Amino acid sequence: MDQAANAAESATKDQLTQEAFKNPENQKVNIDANGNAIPSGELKDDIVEQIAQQAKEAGEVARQQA
């Protein structure tokens, strides 16, 4: 009824999120005290944005069909 509005969305987000990290480009980086780079799970905003879009849009075709 109103669960696909998450299932379709949620399955999509994660999947797109998983494929994002397989590419360093999309990721962000931090600086340890020594001033050296370090990995920080977070992805670039225009990427998080771009995923959390095609997502709620996929979770939309969910409810509309229920």
């Binding site: 980086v29 931090n30 600086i31 020594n34 001033g35 050296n36 920080s40 225009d46």
Partner: protein, 282 residues
């Protein structure tokens, strides 16, 4: 028939063939001063204006000396018609003193050349004097813009501006180097780590922009090298600095950074987290 006075107007002079030392001798016969008595001079260094002179009515006879090479000139006058002469006091010639504006060494690197037009505030260079008698003492016409070690000629750049440093040699000569106001003064606010926003917030604040590309910062390094070699930064093992945010960097919410110590250029850095330092230019 007797020289009783042999004086020299000074004892130091420039070996430029023009700076002259004047010798004055007095010829007497008891209390009576002898006139038109011819006196002969001789030096062991330099050119005498003449080698013979006749005393005036007061028994005086002046002569001059100059030299194109440095050294000790030992002059000696003698009354023509007599055998024994009289030695004047020893004098010394020194080459024109100068501050070489070409051999300015950059403390960090060790490279020598004109003074950089891009100053890493609190940076240091070594001015090199040439000539005089060897001993030097330096001075800045405005310790605020640039200061100099009294006896070593080490200069440390401070405020964006123009002043002139001078040097004086013990033989009492003077030379001066002009420090022209730089195109841009690099200033790393070392307080604490900070974010891209608080960064632009920092530059704009006290005044001035954030550095342009990494290159603009990279250049500083290729001029002064690891900024920690200079006293003022002798402790900061790292000076990762915020660079401008390209069109896409904005969107991606990240920036780039150049390190004024490790160099280590980096990209895709958290534009929000307190990752780098606030280094402002000009």
């Amino acid at each position: 028939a007797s020289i009783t006075e042999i004086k020299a107007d000074k004892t130091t002079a420039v070996a430029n063939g023009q700076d002259a030392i004047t010798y004055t001798v007095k010829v007497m016969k008891g209390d009576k001063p002898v006139s038109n008595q011819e006196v002969t001079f001789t030096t062991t260094l330099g050119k005498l204006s003449n080698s013979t002179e006749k005393t005036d009515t007061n028994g005086y006879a002046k002569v001059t000396l100059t030299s194109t090479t440095p050294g000790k000139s030992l002059v000696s006058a003698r009354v023509s018609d007599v055998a024994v002469d009289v030695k004047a006091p020893e004098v010394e010639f020194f080459t024109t003193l100068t501050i070489d504006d070409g051999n300015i060494e950059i403390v960090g690197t060790g490279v020598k050349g004109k003074l950089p037009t891009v100053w890493l505030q609190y940076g240091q260079v070594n001015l090199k004097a040439s000539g005089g008698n060897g001993k030097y003492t330096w001075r800045s016409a405005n310790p605020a813009i640039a200061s100099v070690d009294a006896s070593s000629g080490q200069v440390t750049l401070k405020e964006k501006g123009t002043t002139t440093i001078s040097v004086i040699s013990s033989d009492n000569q003077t030379a001066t180097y002009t420090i022209a106001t730089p195109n841009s003064l690099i200033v790393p606010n070392m307080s604490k780590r900070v974010t891209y926003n608080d960064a632009v917030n920092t530059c704009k604040n006290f005044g001035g922009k954030l550095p342009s590309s990494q290159n603009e910062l990279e250049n500083v390094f290729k001029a002064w090298g690891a900024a920690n070699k200079y006293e003022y930064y002798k402790s900061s093992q790292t000076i990762i600095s915020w660079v401008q945010q390209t069109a896409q960097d904005a969107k991606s919410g990240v920036a780039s950074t150049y390190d004024l110590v490790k160099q280590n250029p980096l990209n895709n850095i958290k534009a929000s987290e307190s990752n780098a330092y606030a280094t402002c230019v000009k």
